Design a protein around this ligand. Sequence first.
Ligand SMILES: [Zn+2]
Ligand SMILES: [Zn+2]
Ligand SMILES: [Zn+2]
Lengths: 497, 276, 267, 162, 286
Amino acid sequence: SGKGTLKYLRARSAYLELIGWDVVLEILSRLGLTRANVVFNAGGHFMIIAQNTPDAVKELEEIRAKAVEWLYREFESDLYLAIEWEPVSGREFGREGGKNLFAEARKRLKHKLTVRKLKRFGEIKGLFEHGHTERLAECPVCGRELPEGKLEPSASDPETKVCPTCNRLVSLGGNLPKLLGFGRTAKNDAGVLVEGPFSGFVPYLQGGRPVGEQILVKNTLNPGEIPESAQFVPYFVADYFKKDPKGGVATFEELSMASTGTRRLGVMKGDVDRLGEFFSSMDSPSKLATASRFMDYFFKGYIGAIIEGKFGYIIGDVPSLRDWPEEPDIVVVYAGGDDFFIVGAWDQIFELAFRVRRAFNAYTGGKLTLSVGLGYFDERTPIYRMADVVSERLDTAKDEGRNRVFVVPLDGKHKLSYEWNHYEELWRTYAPRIYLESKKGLLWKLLEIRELYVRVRWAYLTAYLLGRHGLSDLFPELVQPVYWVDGVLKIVLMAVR
Amino acid sequence: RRFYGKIVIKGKIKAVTGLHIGSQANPVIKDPHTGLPYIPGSSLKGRLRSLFEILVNSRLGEWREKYPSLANYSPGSCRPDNQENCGKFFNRKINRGWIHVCPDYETALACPVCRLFGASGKESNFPSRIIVRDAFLTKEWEEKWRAGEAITEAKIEVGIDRVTSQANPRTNERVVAGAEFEFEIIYNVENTTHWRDDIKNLLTAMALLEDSYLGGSGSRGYGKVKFIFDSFEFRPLDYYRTGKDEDIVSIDAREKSVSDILSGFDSLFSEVEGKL
Amino acid sequence: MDRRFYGKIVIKGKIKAVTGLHIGSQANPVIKDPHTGLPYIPGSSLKGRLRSLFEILVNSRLGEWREKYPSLANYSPGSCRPDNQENCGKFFNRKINRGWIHVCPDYETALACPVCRLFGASGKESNFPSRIIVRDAFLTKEWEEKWRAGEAITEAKIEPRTNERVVAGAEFEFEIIYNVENTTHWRDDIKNLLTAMALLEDSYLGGSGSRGYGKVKFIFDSFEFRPLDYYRTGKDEDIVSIDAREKSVSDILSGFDSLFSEVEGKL
Amino acid sequence: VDASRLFGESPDVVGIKKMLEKGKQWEAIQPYFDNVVREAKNFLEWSPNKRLANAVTVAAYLTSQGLKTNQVRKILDMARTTELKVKRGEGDIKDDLVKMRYLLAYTVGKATGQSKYSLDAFHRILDPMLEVLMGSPKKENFEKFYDFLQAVVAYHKFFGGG
Amino acid sequence: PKFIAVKLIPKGPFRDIPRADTLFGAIGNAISAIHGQSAVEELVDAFVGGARISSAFPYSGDTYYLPKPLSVEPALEGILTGLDEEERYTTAKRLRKAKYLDLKNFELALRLRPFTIPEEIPYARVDVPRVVLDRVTQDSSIYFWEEIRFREKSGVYFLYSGPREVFDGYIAPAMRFLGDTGIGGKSTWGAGLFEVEFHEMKIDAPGSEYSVTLSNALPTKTPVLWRLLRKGGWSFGRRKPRMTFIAEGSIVKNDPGGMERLELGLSHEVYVYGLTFPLGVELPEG
RNA sequence: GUGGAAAGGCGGGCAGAGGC
RNA sequence: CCUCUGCCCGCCUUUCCAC
Ligand SMILES: [Zn+2]
Ligand SMILES: [Zn+2]
Ligand SMILES: [Zn+2]
């Protein structure tokens, strides 16, 4: 709801991770395997290579049992974990004859999962039993029924009663500057904030000794100050937050109060076009593990390099309202292996969405493209409204032609989303001429001249208007190019109040 | 809950001066498909409720016998003492603004205000008795929008420093003056003792709105709305039960709200008084 | 705290554009109705020039009225162009973009300001609503007929440029509504309103005016009181103080409480 | 450039602005449309963008000439008041179309001196269409001139007039 | 079969599309108004024994929409074997995020035959700003309300199969009270209002063991392929408990649904509609 | 026996200052 | 037809649920 701040949302994303690493690190431990078996673990979707014994399958069916019963007491069917397994042979780990046997044996497993996300909680045996629990209050922030009251007073306003698992994610969401990882240990132990299905997670802060059997360390491959008996799990996370002058993460307000122009909250959400058909030509398990790290490393670690502004050689010249600052005001909420959800100022989340497409295009050889949704919102807009808009507005810029930036006629021959080079060629021309001192009536009426064209009366109307000032060099082909100037005008108008 | 019949009032809202009901270069609200302006039902109900609570607030002494539970309020706002249901009339703090909303079903049955517009309080609440529909444009003014005429304007207003005469102008969109609308108000006859009162109070508050303003600026001229009735039909409980067009119709194509509030209240509604 | 209602003193009448009348917009056209294509005085533009002249009247008199209207102990005559504070001891205490205006910052300061109780205040947290409403004033009926038959209602006046102006002699219909919210001070708020209209007959309305585009002159038709009893009952039982051949400089003149003896009879 | 870049519909609307701001090139290329528009005595004989395409050639035929605006406005601010009476006001504007043709006859008889071929460029093209409004309705067959009314006005500013 | 397609031509916004527990909750509040408590119980017993109403679905000018069965979700690859591998990715995802289908395409999806999806959704969801104003000083306390705004000729309709003496006795009276009283919240701003029409709809179906549903069932056994709905509404100012309902298009196997009754501390008792609306469907091997 | 009940997008703001 | 101005300031959900 509108009661959850950004430090909360940033802690929801960092707690779906630990749910994902609790499940994988219980499959590896009760099967005797090591973290070399985890082929990928990337935004909820992880693949593990194990053995086919009647003792391994007996243990997986307890893990799939206890994880789904955990994910139901905690979250009333908002989140489900589908786990399946395909007994593959030895000869199916690589190409044989002319047919790819590995991708053929991995599409036999994608169908077990497809048929399981339909049947969403078919291992509860009281899923459809309407047992009537009494005195059900209801959390404001997330919406959860909670039995018999038992709601902790919120640390923000003690006149409101939240569920217990949001007082954790405020405290966790406050520790995100300091937090160097998490120690993963027994659920009934000192310091455990959050709980996964199997373990309980302490925060390993900066000045503090790590406790736990296994210690997850964010964003480094260096087991620095871990005991010599623990287990080292490195895991990477895309984590660029603009700070406040406090030790903390900047607010939806405090970011958007540093956008030049009108003050908006910019919200971008996008993912790699046609990714699953990239991983089906990978025919050996060494070749899929290659193609899955490099795509994960881009979104984990070569996006925080972009928000730094490093390597504008390989990016070049992008649509920039102002020159890219030294410490940008961009918050990376969720960065998945094939997609991301970043918020920030409207000003710099616009330049970043061309500083990302341009770097991804060179990070591959060109043979994989992106697709972005972009959003402009008031600061005090709730999240569920904001994200459902931009997820649709990403889906809008996808089912057209899947390589299209969204930025800002009822026939069917038009389409809302600019393509990438299209917008970057409209910006090379129309923007360096108009960026006309306080002549905004030349600009705002021209958008209303444009909005008769949607409804060739517009041509001479622009012709007198460009003439009754004396702007002939500006927009010569404007007297369909009147349709594709709405991107560049409506942005540069916002850059000047 | 003792439903008896529904009284439907249909008339045309007319904008004698340019109406403006905003959204947040300052748009009046519009249908997201046609794009034509409209008057909401939240915005017309609540302007009638507002003008009528100010009406009752002045009369908390004369109305203590005709309306019970009006002797528990002294005229004013409970804003000074941040406690709800104190001894004043405006006694519910919604967010920051204090509105009269009665605390309890057995008092709101006896308020003149909360009986008609409804109320909310612990231990149940009183649902409203009216339904103010949204007032779209009439078809004569769709067919001026189809014809290519304007249907909204863009008015430019300036503020001026009084010593230096420095001007800093802003622009309001407003609907073109003359635009005819089409409203519908569906009273719910839940009791048969007070149905005349609730209709005379609904026409009192519509007569205040014809000298007040609906929406927008109004003190600077944006209201001046005019109500023009067509027909009031009372739908009996048996009419729904059968779907036979057997309902009283009080026909008044050209009457004001002051020519119908007392001039024809007992001469036109005499057939509604009969059937209960 | 405590907004009440007692009636609506309605001032109708007819504005006489004695000289040519120019209230422009954006070859320099006066605003017209978009429907009928005919000019009008806006109520936004008339309420302002009625407030522009009355604040300057109050601006020169801040010392000797703080016993009749309190909360003028806040103000000393001046402005806030010399120093950027939204609220200091100066009368023009509203930023209002680049030009200052007098707006009291609260309900209960403005309840005793003689300006902001009449034309209306605005404020952070609590704010005070206006008591007069000024409708947009259109052409009368007989000047519709002159437009129907080819008589000029506009003219272009080459000044090398053209200021269009509504041709002189033209008449407009203006309706002013005052809301009686407190019976103890309605006399002042009707006297302070007609004080602001006496100043408009000496000043101008719209456009350049210092080059003679003003000389607006009121022609009264009817005062009506409309008590609260009128809204409850549709019968025309309201007070009609006719002043049909009176001037604004005679109604507010001695001859006022002879006209307003029947508003007492309702209180 | 003479009758090479300029073509029928939309070929040289953007490139002819620098040539008109020339003398012998526009004296023969724009003379054919001013005769074809004279041969366009039927006004509503163009439902496509032929009028708006010919509006550029007529405004180029009015560009090198004067075309003073104070004589333009009164003829065309009378053409709106006919349209303002279309909006449920009147149905017979027959008495004003005689006065409408008289104002153009009064205009070409007043502007004397160096403005002869200017106002006679104005007198040439519209009189094939100024006979049409007499025996025709207004709901059709006038409004199509009311679009071509301002079509020639606007590009004449665009080529450097006023 | 041949159903009764009750159209609801809207006169404003709605709050949401009515699900089949808020249509039976509205009929039970209409028939308690125009008849009484002793006719609400004869209403429930005709749904317990006999008749079935569905959820409501949008129409747009003689094209009627119906929910996509989840039966085509697995087989989609084997459905589309007349395509190349460049559009068997891009037909395959739009035919999976699709929510509704025409009356013509829905009859194909039950046969496991290829289909296309609607290009345009007949309604929009928008948030309209609402401001509470203090009577004394006009202080504004703005809040946001989200409502369904329909197109020109679109609206919503539900279906009804059962005996005709129930329809004229309890449904066609109740859907004329509900036309003037509205369905859903904010009915005092003119929200859930409508006119009403009645038609004869025929939907072809295969004959099989399994059947889609077109209503939120509260199934006794586990169904074949489902999709959870976790809603619980409101009832005379008391909060209902939440109940796992199954969304339309879920495949059940010979399951009659069921009505759950609740108590809520009212003078009467509350029956939550949970009965299924079966249409036969052809499945793949699982 | 209706994800319900109550809830005005408003309060204030001269398109004007010089220019025959 | 020329010269400065070309929207500010706010609230941005409140409260009800009978063990
Ligand atoms: Zn919570
Ligand atoms: Zn009340
Ligand atoms: Zn003041």
